[PDB]
Amino acid sequence: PSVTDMSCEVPACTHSSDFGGVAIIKYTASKKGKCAVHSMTNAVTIREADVEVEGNSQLQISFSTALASAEFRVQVCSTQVHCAAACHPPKDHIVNYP
Amino acid sequence: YEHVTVIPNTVGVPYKTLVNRPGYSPMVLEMELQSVTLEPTLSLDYITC
Amino acid sequence: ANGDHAVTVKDAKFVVGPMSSAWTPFDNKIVVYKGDVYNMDYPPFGAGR
Amino acid sequence: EYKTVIPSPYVKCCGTAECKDKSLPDYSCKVFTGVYPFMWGGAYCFCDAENTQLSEAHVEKSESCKTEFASAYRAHTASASAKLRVLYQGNNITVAAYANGDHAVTVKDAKFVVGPMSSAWTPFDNKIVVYKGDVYNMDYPPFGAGRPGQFGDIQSRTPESKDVYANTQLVLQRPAAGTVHVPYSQAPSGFKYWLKERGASLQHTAPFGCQIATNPVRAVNCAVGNIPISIDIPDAAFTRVVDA
Amino acid sequence: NFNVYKATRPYLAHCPDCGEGHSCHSPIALERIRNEATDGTLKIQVSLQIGIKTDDSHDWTKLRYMDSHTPADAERAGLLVRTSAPCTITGTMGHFILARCPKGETLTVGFTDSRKISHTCTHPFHHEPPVIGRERFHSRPQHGKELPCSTYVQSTAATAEEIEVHMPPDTPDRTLMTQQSGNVKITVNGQTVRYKCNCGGSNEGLTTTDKVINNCKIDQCHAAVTNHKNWQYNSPLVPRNAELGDRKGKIHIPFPLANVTCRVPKARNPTVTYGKNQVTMLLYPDHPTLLSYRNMGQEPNYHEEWVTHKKEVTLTVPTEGLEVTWGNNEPYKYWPQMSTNGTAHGHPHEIILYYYELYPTMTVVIV
Amino acid sequence: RVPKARNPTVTYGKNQVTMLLYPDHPTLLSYRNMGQEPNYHEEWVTHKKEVTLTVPTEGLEVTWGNNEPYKYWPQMSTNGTAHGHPHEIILYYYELYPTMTVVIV
Numbered sequence: 001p002s003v004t005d006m007s008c009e010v011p012a013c014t015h016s017s018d019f020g021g022v023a024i025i026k027y028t029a030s031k032k033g034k035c036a037v038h039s040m041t042n043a044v045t046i047r048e049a050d051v052e053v054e055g056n057s058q059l060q061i062s063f064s065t066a067l068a069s070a071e072f073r074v075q076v077c078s079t080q081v082h083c084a085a086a087c088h089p090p091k092d093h094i095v096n097y098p
Numbered sequence: 099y100e101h102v103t104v105i106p107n108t109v110g111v112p113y114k115t116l117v118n119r120p121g122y123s124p125m126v127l128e129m130e131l132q133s134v135t136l137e138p139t140l141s142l143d144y145i146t147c
Numbered sequence: 148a149n150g151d152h153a154v155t156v157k158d159a160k161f162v163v164g165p166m167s168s169a170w171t172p173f174d175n176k177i178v179v180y181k182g183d184v185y186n187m188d189y190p191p192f193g194a195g196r
Numbered sequence: 197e198y199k200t201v202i203p204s205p206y207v208k209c210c211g212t213a214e215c216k217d218k219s220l221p222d223y224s225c226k227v228f229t230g231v232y233p234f235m236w237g238g239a240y241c242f243c244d245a246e247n248t249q250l251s252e253a254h255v256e257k258s259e260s261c262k263t264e265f266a267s268a269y270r271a272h273t274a275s276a277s278a279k280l281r282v283l284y285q286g287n288n289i290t291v292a293a294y295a296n297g298d299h300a301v302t303v304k305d306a307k308f309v310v311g312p313m314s315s316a317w318t319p320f321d322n323k324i325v326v327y328k329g330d331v332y333n334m335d336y337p338p339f340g341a342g343r344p345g346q347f348g349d350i351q352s353r354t355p356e357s358k359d360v361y362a363n364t365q366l367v368l369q370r371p372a373a374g375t376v377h378v379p380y381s382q383a384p385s386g387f388k389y390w391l392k393e394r395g396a397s398l399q400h401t402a403p404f405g406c407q408i409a410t411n412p413v414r415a416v417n418c419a420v421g422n423i424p425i426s427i428d429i430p431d432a433a434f435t436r437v438v439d440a
Numbered sequence: 441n442f443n444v445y446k447a448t449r450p451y452l453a454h455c456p457d458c459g460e461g462h463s464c465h466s467p468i469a470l471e472r473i474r475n476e477a478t479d480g481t482l483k484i485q486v487s488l489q490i491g492i493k494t495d496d497s498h499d500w501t502k503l504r505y506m507d508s509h510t511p512a513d514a515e516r517a518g519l520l521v522r523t524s525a526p527c528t529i530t531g532t533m534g535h536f537i538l539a540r541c542p543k544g545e546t547l548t549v550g551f552t553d554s555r556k557i558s559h560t561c562t563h564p565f566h567h568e569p570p571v572i573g574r575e576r577f578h579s580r581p582q583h584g585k586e587l588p589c590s591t592y593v594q595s596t597a598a599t600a601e602e603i604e605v606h607m608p609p610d611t612p613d614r615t616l617m618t619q620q621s622g623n624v625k626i627t628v629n630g631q632t633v634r635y636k637c638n639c640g641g642s643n644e645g646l647t648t649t650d651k652v653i654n655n656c657k658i659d660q661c662h663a664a665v666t667n668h669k670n671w672q673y674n675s676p677l678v679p680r681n682a683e684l685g686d687r688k689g690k691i692h693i694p695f696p697l698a699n700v701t702c703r704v705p706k707a708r709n710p711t712v713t714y715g716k717n718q719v720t721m722l723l724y725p726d727h728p729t730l731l732s733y734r735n736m737g738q739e740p741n742y743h744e745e746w747v748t749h750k751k752e753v754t755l756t757v758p759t760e761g762l763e764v765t766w767g768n769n770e771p772y773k774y775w776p777q778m779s780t781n782g783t784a785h786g787h788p789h790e791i792i793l794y795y796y797e798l799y800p801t802m803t804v805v806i807v
Numbered sequence: 808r809v810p811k812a813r814n815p816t817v818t819y820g821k822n823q824v825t826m827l828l829y830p831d832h833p834t835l836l837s838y839r840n841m842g843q844e845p846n847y848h849e850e851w852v853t854h855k856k857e858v859t860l861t862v863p864t865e866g867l868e869v870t871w872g873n874n875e876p877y878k879y880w881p882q883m884s885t886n887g888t889a890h891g892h893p894h895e896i897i898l899y900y901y902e903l904y905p906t907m908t909v910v911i912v
């Protein structure tokens with residue numbers, strides 16, 4: 001199912017090793033369907049590789065990065081959505097997992 | 099399609115590649131290494147006890 | 148991971164390698180005890196200090 | 197070499213029956229409809245237009261794989277050895293050393309040590325295929341990506357390795373009118389072609405006149421380079437000029 | 441001591457070529473041919489059994505063959521196999537024949553049954569033996585070198601070889617349904633016959649004795665035999681038990697193969713003269729035989745050639761020797777001596793001609 | 808059966824790590840980097856000692872006793888730096904990329 005009415009948003013992001021960013025996408029798919037999502041640039045990365053969508057709704061994803069002002073083109077069912085975030089540094093100095 | 103890609107040798111992290119096949123919906127896929135092993139040459143010289 | 152092992156799972160084919168760096172953490176002369184290994188220089192056969 | 201197991205063809209009488217698929221080495225199946233049988237008393241069945249026929253076949257290793265096979269090997273540079281005769285005080289002492297500079301042999305207070313070979317040339321490459329009396333500097337197909345009708349027709353790691361990958365295009369054809377047989381298409385192999393055109397044996401094509409010998413593989417008399425050889429010896433075998 | 445074929449039957453098979461132009465359903469039709477023995481011995485899977493009578497004795501001079509749905513017996517003396525020359529019977533066991541045989545586009549097997557009627561079956565089979573060593577021949581020599589190869593052996597208790605044996609489904613023989621003013625007379629001859637009819641009454645079902653089912657045609661009915669006692673191996677030519685795949689059964693398939701040496705012939709030694717950095721070889725044949733040569737520089741510069749007649753070849757030799765192999769004999773080594781001279785120290789100069797031994801036509805640039 | 812070791816207490820500083828460690832029996836300690844060089848180092852220890860370690864830009868491994876290796880990793884540290892009417896930027900460019908990207912300044 002192709003999708004229309006895309007508009008993204010960032011509630012609160014912190015560039016770190018964890019699930020440090022959250023994003024929210026408004027969308028309107030044509031029908032029920034499983035479909036993929038891909039980070040176009042390399043800085044942002046999406047954990048959840050693909051999801052089911054139904055139609056006019058909004059969807060929450062989790063992402064990692066390194067940059068504060070994350071400018072973001074993202075391909076979903078191929079449609080380019082643009083977004084921008086002003087992230088924050090984390091509080092812990094040293095974590096163990098890479 | 100056949101698709102070639104290259105990934106870093108970081109064990110235990112998901113890398114994402116995207117199959118952008120035209121005429122088809124794209125397919126993202128994840129690779130994660132569990133182990134990479136190197137077995138060198140088994141050339142014995144002698145023993146010691 | 149050397150570019151000569153095609154393997155398939157549910158008619159999906161994979162070919163991996165060869166490695167972009169053929170460096171090893173080994174030298175050529177190795178002593179091996181039942182739990183451990185060491186890079187060193189043993190004297191050859193017949194020249195024992 | 198391989199064997200094509202073809203079971204007896206399923207004759208589905210007066211209706212249809214399809215095959216339940218399985219992951220055999222090159223499992224292949226097809227049900228032909230509208231077919232007709234024949235036997236002693238005419239057709240084997242009673243219905244005519246509703247006779248269908250299921251056909252299934254596959255390929256396994258042979259009994260000849262138990263003893264006769266070609267082997268694809270990977271190889272690289274060598275740890276050479278040498279046999280060295282010495283006339284010493286009119287006595288023929290013969291030593292055997294390892295021609296890499298890391299073996300000394302002692303005989304009659306004599307400390308022989310050969311050196312590393314001044315070159316490192318071999319007549320071999322990486323991919324080497326052997327059969328039982330000769331070797332070849334040939335590039336076999338990669339394992340699992342075996343091409344049909346050549347080396348790569350069937351593949352397995354060991355003769356004990358029960359898994360066998362194959363690629364031979366065994367696709368069944370429509371059987372004839374009445375003739376109960378199973379027409380399968382042709383399946384050219386590696387032994388059907390390769391043992392007629394082995395050509396350049398490395399025994400016969402070795403540069404610098406080296407010879408080969410199998411079990412284990414060994415190249416002898418590779419006349420290039422030069423051997424450093426050192427000897428330690430005490431003063432007992434010498435004698436002073438006051439005796440000379 | 442190998443009495444294991446008691447649940448077997450030597451069935452009859454649709455042979456596509458019995459000679460005489462067109463096909464038959466011959467009792468003796470072959471199915472599976474093996475030629476992987478590098479000497480060229482043939483392992484043949486036939487639709488008969490030999491050396492075993494109806495009571496499954498070890499009488500190794502007879503044979504079983506089914507005919508008219510009855511296993512009858514005959515004698516192995518009439519057995520013939522043929523590619524182009526009258527072949528020899530070597531290995532004799534059940535569904536398997538071993539024979540050593542000459543060239544041929546085709547192959548056929550045939551013999552006479554116990555009613556003095558001889559039958560055969562023919563399959564085209566591109567049987568040309570592979571060459572062994574480096575030579576060919578009319579026949580085996582009584583002398584020669586010993587080269588490794590592989591042959592069949594003569595064992596009957598060969599383990600780890602298997603085929604599956606099970607009950608054959610039916611036997612449609614339409615020589616039974618006769619019309620008695622339009623009737624059907626199923627004549628069972630002491631069997632169990634399935635019938636399939638497009639009429640009233642006993643259209644389908646089973647009987648045990650000769651019955652009369654009236655006012656219907658022969659092709660309107662169908663009378664097949666249902667044997668339920670003896671089994672056959674899974675032939676790919678027979679119809680299957682038409683409910684599922686393999687029904688249970690097992691027998692082994694002996695006469696296995698093993699490594700061996702074999703007598704490869706020698707080679708008649710050629711004659712040879714010498715010349716200025718070159719050699720003339722008059723070489724005799726015995727059969728079409730190859731020879732090869734190389735030299736020992738940086739490159740090997742290989743040549744392989746076949747020869748068939750009295751052939752003379754001149755070969756130039758560089759300063760690193762020459763190697764020429766011919767036949768199964770040892771490869772002949774050669775090394776270029778100073779040729780004869782160019783010249784000695786004459787009272788003129790008359791010198792540079794022996795300078796045409798060491799480096800001819802190069803290093804005269806220094807002159 | 809060999810003994811294991813007691814897990815030591817540990818805290819972090821900006822791009823470094825302080826590990827306070829408690830033996831009872833004489834016990835080894837070792838550590839290394841995972842870069843191109845190991846920069847391998849080791850000490851025996853017998854008493855309740857603290858140690859300081861410098862985690863590199865790529866990652867550190869420490870091993871105490873017979874335990875499974877405590878692996879450690881550089882996270883970009885903290886916030887004393889933001890976006891305002893002054894810069895508040897260079898501590899960002901002290902946290903990421905020290906000793907260079909100040910060269911472009």
Ligand SMILES: *[C@@H]1O[C@H](CO)[C@@H](O)[C@H](O)[C@H]1NC(C)=O
Pocket residue numbers: 281283286287288
């Ligand atoms: C030593 O062996 C050579 C052959 O390798 C032989 O010609 C020579 O006579 C022998 N000398 C003695 C003293 O045995």
Ligand SMILES: *[C@@H]1O[C@H](CO)[C@@H](O)[C@H](O)[C@H]1NC(C)=O
Pocket residue numbers: 262263328588698699
């Ligand atoms: C037969 O001999 C060859 C070498 O001569 C060996 O490679 C092979 O494994 C042997 N096979 C058996 C069954 O002994």
